[PDB]
RNA sequence: GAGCUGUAAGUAAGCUUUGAUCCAGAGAUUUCCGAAUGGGGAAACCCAGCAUGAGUUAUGUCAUGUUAUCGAUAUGUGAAUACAUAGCAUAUCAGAAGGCACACCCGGAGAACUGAAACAUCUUAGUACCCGGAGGAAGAGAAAGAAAAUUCGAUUCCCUUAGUAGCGGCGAGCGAAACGGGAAGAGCCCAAACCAACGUUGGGGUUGUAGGACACUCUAGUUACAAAGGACGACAUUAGACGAAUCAUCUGGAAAGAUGAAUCAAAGAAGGUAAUAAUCCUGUAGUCGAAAAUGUUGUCUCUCUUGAGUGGAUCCUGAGUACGACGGAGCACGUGAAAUUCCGUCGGAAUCUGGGAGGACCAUCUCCUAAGGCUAAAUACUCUCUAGUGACCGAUAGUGAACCAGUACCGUGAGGGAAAGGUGAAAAGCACCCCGGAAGGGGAGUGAAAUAGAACCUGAAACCGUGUGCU
RNA sequence: AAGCAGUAAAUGUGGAGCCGUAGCGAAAGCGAGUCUGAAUAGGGCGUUUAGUAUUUGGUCGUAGACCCGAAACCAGGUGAU
RNA sequence: GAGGGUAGCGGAGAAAUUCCAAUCGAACCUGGAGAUAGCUGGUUCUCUCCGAAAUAGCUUUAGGGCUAGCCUCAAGUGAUGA
RNA sequence: UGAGUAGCGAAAGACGGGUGAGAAUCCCGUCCACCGAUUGACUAAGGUUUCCAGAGGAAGGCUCGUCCGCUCUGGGUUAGU
RNA sequence: UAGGCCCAAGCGACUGUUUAUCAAAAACACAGGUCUCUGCUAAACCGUAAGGUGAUGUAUAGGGGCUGACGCCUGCCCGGU
RNA sequence: UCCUAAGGUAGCGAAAUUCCUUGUCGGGUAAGUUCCGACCCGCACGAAAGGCGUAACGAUUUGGGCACUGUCUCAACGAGAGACUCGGUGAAAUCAUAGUACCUGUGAAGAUGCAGGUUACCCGCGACAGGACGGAAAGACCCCGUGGAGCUUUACUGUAGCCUGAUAUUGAAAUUCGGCUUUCUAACCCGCACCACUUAUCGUGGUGGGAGACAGUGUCAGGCGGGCAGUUUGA
């Protein structure tokens, strides 16, 4: 029948105009005393999903 | 054959849950008491629940 | 409207134009077992009571009715125990039971293998299996609704919303509704106030723009819900009847083929006939037709029938109900901030200046009026009957079964389960002679053909034999 | 699309609905520009701004999913000749 | 010897994991059912062109998988290759 | 294919006369051999016509068969104790 | 047709029973000893309801554990369970 | 002198128990790792998962004797059935095709089939068992699979039961700091006696006794629980 979206993946990415996916960074939940100021300030910025990862998870998000 | 002669209450069925959310089948019985109540003829003992014994019921 | 006595041929004896056989409607007969029901029992068996009759000097034997249990109703009806009440006896009952299509529907109860690459929450799944109750459908159904517009107005089914909102060891995974577009489309009856009669039965009364009671002037048959028995013409189904048009030659065993002359068509669908037929046969298009039975509809008869606004002093509008705590379940929603609704236990309201809902909760606004009942249509399925269809099979295929198949056979039992089609157009199925005890064969005949002779259309390979060129 | 009409057709009719013409941001929101930020200061994603409907071929997902093969588990029955 | 009783989440056992229809560390039959199988075996006609790997990282991972490296086809830039 | 190979399921037969297409194997006779707390006579269970007579030799009989528990046709089971 | 006998040692008192189909034994049972539970709708067992066994019995009786004829005996320890 | 609850008593002991071990000494034999009798450095006996003995019994396990014998030195002869020849009838496991020699080498490291050499005219019948890693059973040993089943426990999570408290059924009086505690009878209970249905004491009803707001039963809660169930136990 109809394909099913990955609900856990649709909560973590967004679709851009060119077709890429915008993601958020890891290693930012707690234990901030063990990371330097430069590390924590540069983990506030966003990133994009790599093409290596895109080749594997593109079908899981097709309606998004 | 165990049922309330007036209200019609009887047993149910459900689950028993542990702290880990395991489940097994169990039953919920009714508080049926054997009483003598006036019928057209001789008073015969029937099963009547306690809920039907409130607010005034013949005995 | 001329043959017939089923496969099936055989002989024997018969019936039929005074209408056989055969086809359709309506009847009568219908052994025994089986729910099996007089009792018993290892189904298809044995043994009885009572009342009538046949036969006998009489007994013994026979025939026809009736005799289960439970349930509902009239009747006689001591008990223990004065009265009464269990029990008991007889009568009446198209009262019940069992089977069923391993399909569709509603309810009770309810797994596991599997996935999560292990597994316990979760998933498989409210699925398989079991039990009960039905119907031709069932279930649901006339707002204590959906919502936020200048609002709609019972239920069911399809399209979309949408793999969206959400749920989730937030893992695997699960997954909506309202709006809008369509199919189909009617709504109603009770309890209470209150009045009249001897607790009873009649009348009055059914709601949210607030209705009803009381007091004020007062008259459309819907037999599918809405109240329930019947006489009253047209069709359909179950046997059937008419129904156009071609001749000649050649090959051949046989012409429908080839070659020439024609004809019909509201009929050139199909099947057969000695090979390939619009004009040979059964048919086709189109018309005609019903003793009798059943179904569906319509026309009187027939049967019920009370209608709306103004006044609201006062009265009524469903109770151990709603709801709360504890333990569960169901809502797409795993207890989570969980509304909305169901079960068991324990508590437990209000009365129109009332009650509920709008996703914990309070206030304001908007919508509705729970705790009684009934209801066609659009929807699901096919054990079947009738008439048809296919870029579906063609005997190791197609149903397990084209043939005497749920059969041979196998098992104590539940249960498992095959193989096997084809002469010829027509039996015209080889009279007769020869070898032999017979099977088998060689001639002679039938036939277009017998290397088509029933172990019979065609007749491949493996394998087995006889005779021969070169070695 | 459902539905309706039509020979179980072709295609009429049907504009609920869907994709595209504009992005960015968690959201309120603004808009050829938006987010972060005191500050286009710098930086990220956009300003290409041609799609859309049917269909042949390749591959994927949900269904047993290229074929044959377990040791086992669960449910209802049959058996003490 | 004859007639009977106890049935598989069970029965019987002077006790051996012994027996319950030639089968028992849990009987047989029919269903869930085409259970699951990262494991063996198999997979049917013909030509033309090109043509590998047996490595790294991570892994309840080690004869399994995912990304990168190496092969092929289509489009683009074009001198960036040796 | 193995291959005209293994086997042919505990044991004493010989002769004469018949029948016959065909006789080590069928019928008749004589002699000899074996059992005899049984290889004898009844009979329950179980089987279900295997019982008798007249015919037959396709298949079954571990060889043959003119013969049979095999094939065809016709028969046979009688209770007040 | 019909016991071979003797002298010593281990294990089990004895007669019995057992792996149908590779184990018949020193293994199981046994008569005896001991501990413990049970006042009668007894304890224990099957269903885990009704109804039953125990038992138409009543502590010289009934259920469970260990040991195992007979003779001499059976020593120390209550931190731990 | 250290520790602990106690530090093994009587009996027995190279034992169905002893590794060293064929312990050491005697008996038996020409010769004794087995056997019998003693000794005790008991790796690691021991008192009801009993210790030490013990007539009778055993298709039990051991060691030594008399008698006997083809078991043997060391084999030979005879009888019968099969086997061998002939008449009748007539299968099976196995099998890629086969005109299928030896030696030394070589090869996936043990060749009828490859190299070099040496032997050998074609076809049968009776015998033997060296090879064809000979045939019958997808190795039961070993390892692997995030395969399965049975069993155990102070592995994890549950559960059938069995104890305990609150609350409903559940009532009337009266002492004491609505409650502990005492009497009573009407609820509820009796596999207690008698009567009736009724030829039955299963059941029901009645009447006497016993017990009594307890017990039994419903809902909620805490504890015990390998009796039973589902699973995990790394590379």
DSSP, collapsed to helix, strand or coil, labels residue A47 as strand
Coil, helix or strand for B14? strand
Q: Which nucleotides of C are covered by protein (CB under 7 A)?
A: 85-86, 108-111, 120-122, 162-168, 170-175, 320-321, 327-329, 335, 343-348
* Overall number of domains in chain B: 1
Cα(A64)–Cα(A4) distance, integer angstroms: 11
**Structural domains of chain A, count:** 1
In angstroms, the CA A48 to CA A54 distance is 10
Experimental determination technique: cryo-EM
CA angle B13, B2, B45 (to 5 degrees): 150
Q: Which domain holds residue B58?
A: 1-59
- Calpha distance B31→B58 (Å, rounded): 18
Query: In the complex, which nucleotide's C1' lies nearest to the CA atom of residue B54?
Result: C320
How many other CB atoms are found less than 10 A from the CB of residue A5? 13
CA of B18 to C1' of E19 (A): 42
Q: Which domain holds residue A46?
A: 1-64
Structure tokens at B15: 């689950």
Assigned token pair, B45: 């003992």
Q: Is the CB of A52 under 7 A from strand E?
A: yes
Cα(A59)–Cα(A4) distance, integer angstroms: 10
DSSP string, chain A: ------HHHHTT-EE-SSS-EEE--SS-SS-GGGS-HHHHHHTSS-EE--HHHHHHHTTTSS--
């Amino acid at each position: 029948p109809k394909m099913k979206t990955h609900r856990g993946a649709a909560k973590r990415v967004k679709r851009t105009a060119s077709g890429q996916l915008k993601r958020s960074r890891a290693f930012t939940s707690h234990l901030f005393a063990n990371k330097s100021t430069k590390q924590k300030r540069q983990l506030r910025k966003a990133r994009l999903v790599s093409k290596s990862d895109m080749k594997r998870v593109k079908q899981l998000l097709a309606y998004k | 054959g165990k049922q309330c002669f007036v209200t019609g209450r009887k047993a149910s069925t459900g689950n028993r849950r542990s702290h880990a959310l395991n489940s097994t089948k169990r039953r919920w019985n009714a508080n049926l008491q054997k009483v003598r109540i006036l019928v057209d003829g001789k008073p015969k003992k029937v099963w009547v629940s306690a809920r039907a014994l409130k607010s005034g019921k013949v005995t």
